[PDB]
Design a protein around this nucleic acid. Structure first.
Length: 92
RNA sequence: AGCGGCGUCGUCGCGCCGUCUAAGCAGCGAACCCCGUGGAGAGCCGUAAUGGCGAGAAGCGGGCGAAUCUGUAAUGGCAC
């Protein structure tokens, strides 16, 4: 998993940031959304109800970035193309 | 700089004063803040400075929003 999570971004389409993740969930192009332990649910329960799967990450948005190669923090990380990976299978 | 007085004037052409205009009414609105887009990292954008940023930067549109300024208030006062 330690390498599958990296390869999901190394050889896969993802969009980082809550705004773009919510847009991807709204328009359906995202296979799923990965959310950190600190992300609220006031807007997120709607995308939970929607057919877009919601994966929960084991750590905060601060440390979700370094494991996905981003120097910044990531809260919502909707994926577009799984690519050379089965992160969707890992989620559900 | 122009204009109108006063002063000086042994030589010079300088020195001084004035050359005005309220509130109200109407118009614009800097910063901050907010809204819509945007997607920025072997990093970018700022400030006098501290800083800001995928929990969404820059850039681009909109809204809100000052002092003051502009007109009007004009046929007032001034050696009209």
């Amino acid at each position: 998993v330690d390498k599958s999570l990296i390869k999901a971004v190394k050889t896969g389409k993802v969009i980082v940031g809550a705004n773009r993740t919510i847009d991807a969930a709204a328009n359906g192009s995202a296979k799923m959304v990965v959310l950190a332990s600190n992300c609220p649910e006031d807007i997120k329960k709607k995308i939970q109800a929607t057919d877009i799967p919601v994966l929960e990450y084991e750590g905060t948005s601060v440390e979700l970035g370094p494991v996905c190669g981003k120097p910044f923090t990531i809260a919502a990380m909707a994926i577009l193309d799984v690519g050379e990976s089965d992160i969707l299978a890992a989620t559900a």
